[PDB]
Each structure stands twice: as C-alpha cells, then as structure tokens.
C-alpha cells in the first residue's frame, strides 16, 4: 500500500512505479507517471480501445467498473503525451506507452470508471441549522453507520464496496468491524431498523493518524456485499489534483447531526449550503492558532448559524462543478454548532486520494 507511487522500486519487476495511474481535472483527463522524467503526462486517444480502459480502471483501484471513455481536447497545457503502439504483442498497457510530442487526433482521453456525481433534481434543501425540509434522492452517497443499532457517525460512498468516514469514530476500542453496521438510502432514522443494514467486513484507519491534534483523520469501511446502485443510492466521484478550487465556493454539507450544540441527533437527514474557508485564513493565530494541518479544511461561515454538529461527523463536503459532485472534505470535528468564530473543521480528502487507492488495490 504505502510502497505504491513513492519513486522507489520495491518489487523486482518494478510494477510499483510503472503502473502509477491517476485521473486529472474536472473532465477526467487520464495521467500516467513517467519514471524516466519523474512527472505525470496525459495519454493520447490514438490507437486506443476500451480493453485498455479495463486494465486502467483495474489498476486504479476500481476493479472491473467502467462507465465510459471518450476523447477530449487537451486543457492542462502539457508538452508531452503518452502514445500507445499496437505493434507490441504483450497484453500490458504500460509497456505499450511511450512519449510523443503530440497526438494525431489532437485529443486526450477522458476516462470514467464509475457513474458518479449525479443525483435527482432537488430544489429546496437547507435542513441543517436555520432552514427548511429536504427531499429524497439528492444525496444518495450519504450513508449512516451504526453501533448497537444507534447512530454514531455518518458516511459517504465512492464504490459499491467502500464507505469513507472519520477515524475518530473508529478509534479504539471501536476498531472491530463486527460492531459497525451501515444503512444506505434511508432518510428516516426510524426506518433503518428492519433488515436494511450493510455490515462492515473490515475497518481501515490511517497509519499516521494522531488523536492529540486529530490530524490525518480518515477511515474506510468496506462491506461484504457490494451496494446495488439505483436512483436512491449512487456514488460520488473522488476529486482529482489540479482543480482551481476558488475561495468562497458554494459547497454542500450533509449528515444526521443535531440542530444545536449538545442536542440530540436529527430524526431525518439534514443538508445545507456552506462556503469554503481558506486554510491560510484559518491557521492564523486568530481562528485556531496554527491548529490546521495541510491535511485539514475549514468550511462554513465565520458568522456561524450554518455549521456541522455532533452526528454530522463522517458526512460529505460536496460541491457542484460541471454537473459532477466532488467529495473534497470529511467532517472531522467541530468546535460548537452554529456558532460564530468557530466554524466547522473538515479533513482534507484531496491529500488522501492516493492513500484511498493504495488501500483499494491491495484489498480487491
């Protein structure tokens, strides 16, 4: 896992560095790490068929899932592109790639390994503090995780088999997957009782997670049975490095958290709009006194009244961009609820995107 994509070859064959693959941009432009130049370069559309996309998604920790793949005009400004060749008789794509100045079709590959980031149309949903009721189907990735059939922390899905949440909920002695039980696609907490559970087969925690500063707070729950996708349950695409996330950008938070501090959890799932807070704005002596690690995100309003609470932990921090939702943050902790000068503090998924894939491939 941790030996993957580090610049040092571990196995004698060198598959660790030759098969380093990731996506890029909101339009999902594929990149392949070049060991000769220690840089990421996109791939050409020329002489490419979907059988190679199968292997690409397989090595990207997505197994056999493959939604669609088409060629798009290049936008990252890269000077070099990987070029495939059909003369080689081998079945491995990465030995078929070589550097070229440009592609003949003047296009790069847009790879979609899973149909994510799409939900049913919803008009009015601001159910977190100071708002109105919500509607089903707008947040199908949001799931609830239960211990002894009561809610503890929320969760969001990215694949039919994996659920991501916060590590402080899975802290000792709750590091046993037998105690956890997940429910998917149910809005009312009074309905997730009879046979709607999805048991977690193994819990995954961050190796460098530290509870004193609550940094590197990430956790991955894996189910035995893959989730059957329909209108009420859909995944959310994992965000890619290279998106210009503007300040103040309108984001959405969700969860079963309380409507006030120290209060009871909400009966129905709540979701309301919040805004980004820049990290250099948050890690000053003023907001949290250098408490924000680069793997942490501050979101919400400094004026308060719209913020996460207890029970909102494990919820998704999502934004809309090119009609695709992106899971950029995970609710780690919050100093108070709906209060000024102490907004919601979220864990940075973007730093741990590669770590998620490292755990995905080794547990496939």
């Amino acid at each position: 896992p941790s030996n993957w994509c580090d610049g040092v070859s571990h196995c004698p064959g060198g598959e660790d560095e030759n098969r380093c693959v990731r996506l890029y941009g909101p339009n999902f432009i594929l990149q392949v790490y070049s060991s000769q130049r220690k840089s990421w370069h996109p791939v050409c559309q020329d002489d490419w068929n979907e059988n190679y996309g199968r292997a690409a998604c397989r090595d990207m920790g997505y197994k056999n899932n493959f939604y669609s793949s088409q060629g798009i005009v290049d936008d990252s400004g890269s000077t070099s592109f990987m070029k495939l060749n059909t003369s080689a008789g081998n079945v491995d794509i990465y030995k078929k790639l070589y550097h070229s100045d440009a592609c003949s079709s003047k296009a790069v590959v847009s790879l979609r390994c899973i149909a994510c980031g799409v939900n049913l149309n919803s008009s009015r949903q601001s159910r977190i503090v100071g708002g109105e009721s919500a509607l089903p189907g707008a947040w199908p990735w949001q799931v609830s995780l239960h211990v002894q059939n009561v809610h503890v922390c929320g969760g969001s899905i990215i694949t039919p088999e994996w659920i991501v949440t916060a590590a402080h909920c899975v802290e000792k002695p709750l590091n046993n997957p037998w105690h956890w039980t997940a429910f998917a696609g149910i809005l009312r907490q009074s309905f997730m009782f009879y046979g709607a559970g999805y048991q977690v087969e193994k819990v995954i925690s961050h190796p460098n997670y530290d509870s004193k500063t609550k940094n590197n707070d990430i956790a991955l729950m894996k189910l035995q049975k893959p989730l059957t996708f329909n209108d009420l349950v859909k995944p959310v695409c994992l965000p890619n490095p290279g998106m210009m996330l503007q300040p103040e950008q309108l984001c959405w938070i969700s969860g079963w958290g309380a409507t006030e501090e120290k209060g009871k959890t909400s009966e129905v799932l709540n979701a309301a709009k919040v805004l980004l807070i820049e990290t250099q704005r948050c890690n000053s002596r003023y907001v949290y006194d250098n408490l924000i690690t680069p793997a942490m995100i501050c979101a919400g309003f400094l004026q308060g009244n719209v913020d996460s609470c207890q029970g909102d932990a494990g919820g998704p921090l999502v934004t809309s961009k090119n009609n695709i939702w992106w899971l950029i943050g995970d609710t780690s902790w919050g100093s108070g609820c709906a209060k000024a000068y102490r907004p919601g503090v979220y864990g940075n998924v973007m730093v741990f995107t590669d770590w998620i894939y490292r755990q995905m491939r080794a547990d496939g």
Binding site: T213, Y288, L302, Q303, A340, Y341
Partner: protein
C-alpha cells in the same frame, strides 16, 4: 431699523475652521444681513440653493438662519452631491434636503487659517482619546461611527484573564456602575485555557455584529459621529490588575483618516445655509430699499 448687522462675513472668514467630525454651527437672529456684501467680501466658489430661489433671498425677512462650516477634504469633494452615501455624508454630516437650503463654497488663504480637530463622542474621550496629533492644515474625517450605550467597557475582567493561558486580553477596571466586557472560555486541542472575546478584530471587520457591543450607525440631520473603532485588544496593558484604569491607546482608535484642504494655495471650507420662516420674523435684509 436701529438694530445692528448680522456680521455673517466675520464668522466664515475666521481663522479657526473645524473639521466635519466636529462641524460647528451658529444661529443668526434679529440682525441685518447682506448676501451681496458676503459675496464680495469672501471669495465664494459656488452658490446653489435647493428648492429655493436665489433672487428671492435678496431683501427678504426670515425667522432664523442656521449655518454650518468645516474645511473640506480634497479626496471627498464628490461626497457633497445630494443623495450621496460617501464617508462625509454617511458618517460626518447629512444635508437637510427637505428644507429650503443653500450650499456655500467659500475659501480662505492658507497663510492665516488654523484648523481645529475635536472628537464629539463622549465615550471616545472617556476611554483614552485626548486629541488629534495631526499635521498643519489637516482635516480629520470619520470613515464610520459606532454607537454604544452607557454601560460599555472595552476592557475585560482581570479575574477572568488571570486563568487565560492562551490569548489573554489586556484587562483593567471599569468605572463603577458599568458592565464588563463580554468574554468566554473554551478548550480545543490541548489549548486548555483557550479564551476568545467578541469584536476580536477591528469592529468593522467584526464578523458577528449581534454579539459585538459596538453597533454601527448612520448620522442624521444635526447629529454628529457616534464614535470610533477603538480596538479593545489594545485597550489596557497585559497582566493588568484593578489598580490600572481602562484606557485605550492612540493606535487603538480606528475608522478615521485625514486629507488636506488646500486648493491653489487656498483652503476650501464648505458652508450650508438653512433658512427658516420666509417672509416672517424681524431679521430682515437691506439689499433693497
């Protein structure tokens, strides 16, 4: 008729000219006045009347004439247009548009005029402010005004601050009968004595106004500025006991700036004329026989 002159001209050309923060106002009554003599004695730039006739001013009797004067900054000349929302109109002086009023633009040489700056807010001078340490021919104008009540303190309780390991604010003793500064204590991630207080940054930059004791206000017709920023985190000294007094330093006062009034070696001063009781009273005019 056996009754002296108003001597309006002798008041406008006085070498002591105030600022829009502390604009003066004099009331003229039961006296004779001449607008033509005023026009020729003092170099008047512009003369415009709002909802009134300039020709009917000559030889007309009034009840009382209300006057204002303050040297004008060069930067905010555009604020004097009717219906504006500039710094001068929203924080220093609002013009009476409804009443029949005339606007006077007159100037004095810079070799004799002496500028005067004063703070009209009571609680501003109560909590540390003394005067304005400004340059010669400098006009002080207020960005915004903050209105507080009689029970407002910019200093926290020393007993509360004795247990604030992190971010302990300066503390002192309020005058008796007043209410202490609002503060609260929490703890986050091994900051066992974390302490935060309302209006932590500049009160203009204060994100939450409801919990902030200082409330921004708009100046009315005849009123003055309510107050300054008066940053509280600089009010008093660190580790201050009850023997020290709640005093804010000079740099703590915010929401104000300055600009000169010179224009071709001539300081420009704005005057507003308010006329009451047209064709009435005894302070008639002798511009006509």
């Amino acid at each position: 008729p056996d009754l002296p002159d108003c001597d309006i001209d002798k008041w406008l050309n006085n070498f002591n000219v105030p600022s829009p923060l502390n604009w003066e106002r004099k009331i003229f009554s039961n006296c004779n006045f001449n607008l033509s003599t005023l026009l020729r004695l003092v170099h008047t730039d512009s003369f415009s009347c709002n909802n009134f006739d300039e020709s009917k001013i000559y030889g007309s009797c009034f009840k009382s004439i209300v006057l204002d004067k303050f040297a004008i900054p060069n930067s905010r000349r555009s604020d004097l247009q009717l219906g504006s929302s500039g710094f001068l109109q929203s924080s220093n002086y609002k013009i009476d548009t409804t009443s029949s009023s005339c606007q006077l633009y007159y100037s004095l040489p810079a070799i004799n005029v002496t500028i005067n700056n004063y703070n009209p807010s009571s609680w501003n001078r109560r909590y540390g402010f003394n005067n304005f340490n400004l340059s010669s021919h400098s006009v002080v104008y207020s960005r915004y005004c903050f209105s507080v009540n009689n029970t407002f303190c910019p200093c926290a309780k020393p007993s509360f601050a004795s247990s604030c390991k992190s971010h302990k604010p300066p503390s002192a003793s309020c005058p008796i009968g007043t209410n202490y500064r609002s503060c609260e204590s929490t703890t986050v991630l091994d900051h066992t004595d974390w302490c935060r207080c309302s209006c932590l940054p500049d009160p203009i930059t204060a994100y939450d106004p409801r919990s902030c004791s200082q409330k921004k206000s708009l100046v009315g017709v005849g009123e003055h500025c309510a107050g300054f920023g008066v940053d509280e985190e600089k009010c008093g000294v660190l580790d201050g006991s009850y023997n020290v007094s709640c005093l804010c330093s000079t740099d703590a006062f915010l929401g104000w700036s300055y600009d000169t009034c010179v224009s071709n070696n001539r300081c420009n001063i704005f005057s507003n004329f308010i006329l009451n009781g047209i064709n009435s009273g005894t302070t008639c005019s002798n511009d006509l026989l």
